[PDB]
Protein backbone atom coordinates (compact mmCIF):
# COMPACT_ATOMS: atom_id res chain seq x y z
CA UNK A 1 0.00 0.00 0.00
CA UNK A 2 0.85 3.65 -0.31
CA UNK A 3 3.55 5.31 1.73
CA UNK A 4 6.71 7.39 1.54
CA UNK A 5 9.32 4.80 0.54
CA UNK A 6 11.08 4.34 -2.82
CA UNK A 7 8.57 1.75 -3.92
CA UNK A 8 5.26 3.20 -2.66
CA UNK A 9 5.94 6.95 -2.41
CA UNK A 10 4.14 9.95 -3.91
CA UNK A 11 5.27 9.21 -7.47
CA UNK A 12 3.34 5.91 -7.29
CA UNK A 13 0.12 7.13 -5.72
CA UNK A 14 -1.58 7.91 -9.03
CA UNK A 15 -1.84 4.19 -9.83
CA UNK A 16 -4.31 3.64 -6.98
CA UNK A 17 -5.59 7.24 -6.80
CA UNK A 18 -5.73 8.74 -10.29
CA UNK A 19 -6.92 12.09 -8.90
CA UNK A 20 -3.24 12.44 -7.93
CA UNK A 21 -2.89 14.01 -11.41
CA UNK A 22 -5.96 16.18 -10.94
CA UNK A 23 -6.54 19.87 -11.47
CA UNK A 24 -6.41 21.03 -7.84
CA UNK A 25 -3.79 18.94 -6.10
CA UNK A 26 -1.78 19.89 -3.04
CA UNK A 27 0.74 20.86 -1.88
CA UNK A 28 2.07 23.55 -4.20
CA UNK A 29 4.98 25.93 -4.33
CA UNK A 30 3.87 29.34 -3.17
CA UNK A 31 5.56 31.71 -5.57
CA UNK A 32 5.35 34.86 -3.48
CA UNK A 33 5.80 37.22 -6.41
CA UNK A 34 3.02 35.53 -8.43
CA UNK A 35 0.51 35.54 -5.53
CA UNK A 36 -1.82 38.53 -5.47
CA UNK A 37 -2.84 40.58 -2.48
CA UNK A 38 -6.61 40.37 -2.18
CA UNK A 39 -7.99 43.24 -0.11
CA UNK A 40 -11.39 41.51 0.06
CA UNK A 41 -9.85 38.70 2.15
CA UNK A 42 -10.83 38.99 5.81
CA UNK A 43 -8.71 38.32 8.89
CA UNK A 44 -8.82 34.70 9.92
CA UNK A 45 -10.90 33.95 12.99
CA UNK A 46 -9.22 31.14 14.95
CA UNK A 47 -11.40 30.31 17.97
CA UNK A 48 -9.70 27.57 19.95
CA UNK A 49 -10.34 28.62 23.58
CA UNK A 50 -12.92 25.87 24.09
CA UNK A 51 -10.99 23.19 22.19
CA UNK A 52 -11.27 19.65 23.57
CA UNK A 53 -8.32 17.49 22.61
CA UNK A 54 -8.89 13.78 23.18
CA UNK A 55 -6.21 11.51 21.87
CA UNK A 56 -2.96 11.25 19.94
CA UNK A 57 -2.68 8.47 17.33
CA UNK A 58 0.14 7.10 15.22
CA UNK A 59 -1.74 6.22 12.02
CA UNK A 60 1.32 5.05 10.09
CA UNK A 61 1.53 8.26 8.03
CA UNK A 62 1.93 10.79 10.83
CA UNK A 63 0.63 11.34 14.35
CA UNK A 64 -2.77 12.97 14.74
CA UNK A 65 -3.93 14.92 17.76
CA UNK A 66 -7.69 14.43 17.65
CA UNK A 67 -10.41 16.72 19.00
CA UNK A 68 -14.05 16.53 19.97
CA UNK A 69 -15.77 17.82 16.83
CA UNK A 70 -19.32 16.93 17.90
CA UNK A 71 -19.92 20.64 18.76
CA UNK A 72 -18.55 24.07 17.66
CA UNK A 73 -15.75 24.12 20.27
CA UNK A 74 -12.69 24.83 18.13
CA UNK A 75 -13.53 26.57 14.90
CA UNK A 76 -12.03 28.41 12.00
CA UNK A 77 -14.05 31.12 10.25
CA UNK A 78 -13.42 34.24 8.24
CA UNK A 79 -10.44 34.61 5.96
CA UNK A 80 -11.48 33.17 2.56
CA UNK A 81 -14.10 30.96 4.19
CA UNK A 82 -17.84 30.95 4.00
CA UNK A 83 -19.28 29.35 7.09
CA UNK A 84 -17.87 27.57 10.11
CA UNK A 85 -15.23 24.87 10.08
CA UNK A 86 -14.64 22.55 13.07
CA UNK A 87 -11.21 21.34 14.10
CA UNK A 88 -11.04 17.55 13.91
CA UNK A 89 -7.29 16.88 14.13
CA UNK A 90 -3.84 18.27 13.61
CA UNK A 91 -0.66 16.58 12.50
CA UNK A 92 2.75 17.34 11.02
CA UNK A 93 4.87 16.36 8.06
CA UNK A 94 8.64 16.42 8.52
CA UNK A 95 11.97 15.48 7.08
CA UNK A 96 15.00 13.38 7.78
CA UNK A 97 17.05 16.63 7.81
CA UNK A 98 16.21 20.20 8.83
CA UNK A 99 16.33 21.37 5.20
CA UNK A 100 13.31 19.35 4.11
CA UNK A 101 9.99 18.19 5.50
CA UNK A 102 7.35 20.72 4.52
CA UNK A 103 4.74 19.96 1.88
CA UNK A 104 4.16 23.49 0.68
CA UNK A 105 7.24 25.45 -0.28
CA UNK A 106 7.79 29.19 -0.45
CA UNK A 107 9.72 30.32 -3.53
CA UNK A 108 10.94 26.71 -3.59
CA UNK A 109 12.19 26.90 0.02
CA UNK A 110 11.42 23.77 2.03
CA UNK A 111 10.95 24.08 5.77
CA UNK A 112 11.86 21.44 8.37
CA UNK A 113 8.23 20.56 8.93
CA UNK A 114 4.65 21.65 8.35
CA UNK A 115 1.70 21.60 10.72
CA UNK A 116 -1.79 20.92 9.39
CA UNK A 117 -4.83 21.84 11.47
CA UNK A 118 -7.68 20.11 9.67
CA UNK A 119 -11.20 21.53 9.87
CA UNK A 120 -14.47 20.55 8.22
CA UNK A 121 -17.43 22.62 7.09
CA UNK A 122 -20.25 22.12 9.57
CA UNK A 123 -22.96 22.50 6.97
CA UNK A 124 -22.02 19.07 5.66
CA UNK A 125 -22.77 17.42 9.00
CA UNK A 126 -19.80 15.05 9.20
CA UNK A 127 -16.22 14.84 7.95
CA UNK A 128 -17.04 11.98 5.59
CA UNK A 129 -19.62 14.09 3.80
CA UNK A 130 -17.37 17.14 3.88
CA UNK A 131 -14.53 15.46 1.98
CA UNK A 132 -16.93 14.87 -0.92
CA UNK A 133 -17.48 18.64 -1.37
CA UNK A 134 -15.25 21.23 -3.08
CA UNK A 135 -15.50 23.46 0.00
CA UNK A 136 -15.65 20.69 2.59
CA UNK A 137 -12.39 21.25 4.47
CA UNK A 138 -10.21 24.14 5.57
CA UNK A 139 -6.63 23.27 6.43
CA UNK A 140 -4.49 25.77 8.29
CA UNK A 141 -0.87 25.11 7.37
CA UNK A 142 2.01 26.43 9.44
CA UNK A 143 5.69 26.04 8.58
CA UNK A 144 8.26 24.94 11.18
CA UNK A 145 11.83 26.20 11.13
CA UNK A 146 14.55 25.03 13.46
CA UNK A 147 15.81 27.49 16.06
CA UNK A 148 14.40 28.24 19.50
CA UNK A 149 12.08 25.71 21.11
CA UNK A 150 8.29 26.06 20.80
CA UNK A 151 7.04 25.73 24.40
CA UNK A 152 3.52 24.82 23.32
CA UNK A 153 4.82 21.90 21.29
CA UNK A 154 6.66 20.19 24.13
CA UNK A 155 3.61 18.32 25.51
CA UNK A 156 3.24 16.73 22.05
CA UNK A 157 6.95 15.83 21.80
CA UNK A 158 6.98 14.28 25.24
CA UNK A 159 4.19 11.76 24.55
CA UNK A 160 5.63 10.40 21.27
CA UNK A 161 7.53 7.63 23.06
CA UNK A 162 4.14 6.13 23.93
CA UNK A 163 2.91 5.98 20.30
CA UNK A 164 6.06 4.85 18.55
CA UNK A 165 4.47 2.47 16.06
CA UNK A 166 1.49 2.39 13.73
CA UNK A 167 -1.84 1.88 15.44
CA UNK A 168 -0.76 3.05 18.88
CA UNK A 169 -2.68 5.81 20.63
CA UNK A 170 -2.62 7.62 23.94
CA UNK A 171 -4.88 9.93 25.93
CA UNK A 172 -4.11 13.53 25.04
CA UNK A 173 -6.61 15.70 26.88
CA UNK A 174 -6.34 19.36 27.82
CA UNK A 175 -3.97 20.32 25.03
CA UNK A 176 -4.25 23.88 23.81
CA UNK A 177 -3.48 24.23 20.10
CA UNK A 178 -3.19 28.01 20.42
CA UNK A 179 0.34 27.26 21.64
CA UNK A 180 1.30 26.12 18.12
CA UNK A 181 0.37 29.37 16.33
CA UNK A 182 2.80 32.08 15.24
CA UNK A 183 2.21 35.71 16.24
CA UNK A 184 0.78 36.82 12.88
CA UNK A 185 -2.16 35.22 11.11
CA UNK A 186 -1.26 36.70 7.70
CA UNK A 187 -1.80 33.98 5.09
CA UNK A 188 -1.88 32.73 1.54
CA UNK A 189 -4.92 30.83 0.31
CA UNK A 190 -5.76 28.62 -2.68
CA UNK A 191 -8.08 25.69 -3.51
CA UNK A 192 -6.47 22.28 -3.25
CA UNK A 193 -6.61 18.76 -1.92
CA UNK A 194 -5.77 16.29 0.80
CA UNK A 195 -2.02 15.62 0.56
CA UNK A 196 -2.37 11.90 1.32
CA UNK A 197 -4.60 9.30 -0.34
CA UNK A 198 -7.40 9.54 -1.27
CA UNK A 199 -6.13 13.00 -2.38
CA UNK A 200 -9.67 14.39 -2.54
CA UNK A 201 -10.03 17.90 -3.94
CA UNK A 202 -12.02 19.26 -1.02
CA UNK A 203 -9.66 21.69 0.73
CA UNK A 204 -9.43 25.43 1.07
CA UNK A 205 -5.78 25.87 2.02
CA UNK A 206 -4.80 28.67 4.36
CA UNK A 207 -1.01 28.75 4.76
CA UNK A 208 0.41 31.15 7.32
CA UNK A 209 3.17 33.51 6.23
CA UNK A 210 5.05 33.33 9.55
CA UNK A 211 6.74 30.05 10.47
CA UNK A 212 6.97 28.88 14.03
CA UNK A 213 10.36 28.03 15.48
CA UNK A 214 10.94 24.65 17.08
CA UNK A 215 14.20 23.34 18.51
CA UNK A 216 16.42 20.76 16.87
CA UNK A 217 15.62 18.44 19.79
CA UNK A 218 11.86 18.77 19.28
CA UNK A 219 11.95 17.82 15.60
CA UNK A 220 14.56 15.14 16.31
CA UNK A 221 11.94 13.43 18.45
CA UNK A 222 9.43 13.38 15.55
CA UNK A 223 12.07 11.40 13.62
CA UNK A 224 12.16 8.62 16.23
CA UNK A 225 8.61 7.59 15.37
CA UNK A 226 8.04 4.51 13.19
CA UNK A 227 6.00 3.96 10.00
CA UNK A 228 5.75 0.27 10.91
CA UNK A 229 3.63 -1.57 13.47
CA UNK A 230 5.02 -3.08 16.64
CA UNK A 231 6.87 -6.31 15.93
CA UNK A 232 7.72 -5.32 12.37
CA UNK A 233 11.06 -4.19 10.96
CA UNK A 234 11.76 -0.62 12.09
CA UNK A 235 11.26 2.05 9.46
CA UNK A 236 11.76 5.56 10.87
CA UNK A 237 8.87 7.94 10.25
CA UNK A 238 10.76 10.60 8.31
CA UNK A 239 10.14 12.39 4.99
CA UNK A 240 6.39 11.85 5.27
CA UNK A 241 5.76 14.77 2.91
CA UNK A 242 4.29 14.93 -0.57
CA UNK A 243 6.28 17.21 -2.90
CA UNK A 244 4.80 20.25 -4.60
CA UNK A 245 2.35 19.55 -7.41
CA UNK A 246 1.58 21.68 -10.50
CA UNK A 247 -0.51 24.77 -9.82
CA UNK A 248 -2.39 24.40 -13.11
CA UNK A 249 -5.31 26.81 -13.41
CA UNK A 250 -5.16 28.28 -9.93
CA UNK A 251 -4.19 31.54 -8.31
CA UNK A 252 -2.76 31.95 -4.83
CA UNK A 253 -4.15 34.97 -2.96
CA UNK A 254 -2.35 36.80 -0.12
CA UNK A 255 -4.11 38.43 2.82
CA UNK A 256 -1.20 40.84 3.22
CA UNK A 257 0.80 43.34 1.20
ZN1 LIG B 1 -1.07 16.94 6.39
UniProtKB/Swiss-Prot annotation:
Active site: 61
UniProt-annotated binding residues for Zn(2+): 91, 93, 116
One Pfam family of this chain: Carb_anhydrase
SUPFAM superfamilies documented for this protein: Carbonic anhydrase
Residue numbers bearing the Phosphoserine modification: 162, 169
Mutagenesis or variant effect for residue 64 to H: Enhanced proton transfer
PROSITE patterns tied to this protein: ALPHA_CA_1, ALPHA_CA_2
EC number: 4.2.1.1, 4.2.1.69
Gene3D superfamilies for this protein: Alpha carbonic anhydrase (3.10.200.10)
Outcome recorded upon mutating residue 4 to H: Reduced proton transfer rate
Reaction catalysis annotation: hydrogencarbonate + H(+) = CO2 + H2O; urea = cyanamide + H2O
Cofactor mode of binding and number, as noted: Zinc. Can also use cobalt(II) with lower efficiency, but not copper(II), nickel(II) and manganese(II).
Resulting phenotype, residue 194 to E/H/R: Strongly reduced CO(2) hydrase activity
Effect of residue 116 to E: Strongly reduced activity
Subcellular location: Cytoplasm; Cell membrane
Positions contributing to substrate binding: 195-196
Residue ranges of domain Alpha-carbonic anhydrase in the record: 1-256
Keywords: Acetylation, Cell membrane, Cytoplasm, Disease variant, Lyase, Membrane, Metal-binding, Osteopetrosis, Phosphoprotein, Zinc
Extra remark: Target of drugs used in treatments against glaucoma disorder and breast cancer.
Similarity annotation: Belongs to the alpha-carbonic anhydrase family.
Protein name, entry field: Carbonic anhydrase 2
Biological source species: Homo sapiens
